[PDB]
């Protein structure tokens, strides 16, 4: 609603989570840079000691 | 006149039947889980979230 876009039809069980499907459908740059960090925020499995 | 020999007749019918009136008392239908209920196209009714 902040950008005036139509609210998304998100069916049950789509393989794309609705932040991973709204970084492609949004056309801003700063709220499409935060939605890229949330879509690729992962733990980094390193072996220490 | 009651001519006896010219008035007998051989009535031919069957030996045994088993007449069943109602037929849908034999099948036992079921239903899949209504969240997996499918319309005429193979997506599901009430799919959205």
From TrEMBL, chain B:
Sumoylated with SUMO1 and SUMO2. Sumoylation of viral proteins seems to have a positive role on viral replication. Signal peptide: none annotated. It is found in: Virion. The record marks 8, 10 as: Interaction with the intermediate capsid protein VP6. Belongs to the rotavirus VP2 family. Homodecamer; each decamer is made up of two conformers of VP2, called VP2A and VP2B. Interacts with a VP1-VP3 complex. Interacts with the intermediate capsid protein VP6. Interacts with NSP5. Interacts (via N-terminus) with NSP2. The N-terminus binds RNA. It is necessary for encapsidation of VP1 and VP3. The N-termini of 10 VP2 molecules form a cylindrical hub underneath each 5-fold axis of the inner capsid. Inner capsid protein that self-assembles to form an icosahedral capsid with a T=2 symmetry, which consists of 120 copies of VP2, with channels at each of its five-fold vertices. This capsid constitutes the innermost concentric layer of the viral mature particle. It encapsidates the polymerase VP1, the capping enzyme VP3 and the genomic dsRNA, thereby defining the core. This is Inner capsid protein VP2. It comes from Rotavirus A. The gene is VP2. The chain holds residues 839 to 887 of 887 of the full protein.
């Amino acid at each position: 609603p902040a950008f005036g876009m139509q609210r998304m039809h998100y069916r049950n069980g789509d393989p794309q989570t609705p932040f991973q499907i709204a970084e492609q459908q949004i056309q801003n740059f700063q709220v499409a840079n935060w939605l890229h960090f949330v879509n690729n925020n992962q733990f980094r499995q390193v072996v220490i000691d | 006149q009651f001519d006896f020999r010219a008035s007998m007749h051989m009535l031919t019918s069957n030996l045994t039947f088993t007449v069943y009136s109602d037929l849908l008392a034999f099948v036992s239908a079921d239903t899949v889980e209504p969240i997996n209920a499918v319309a005429f196209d193979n997506m599901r009714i009430m799919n959205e979230l």
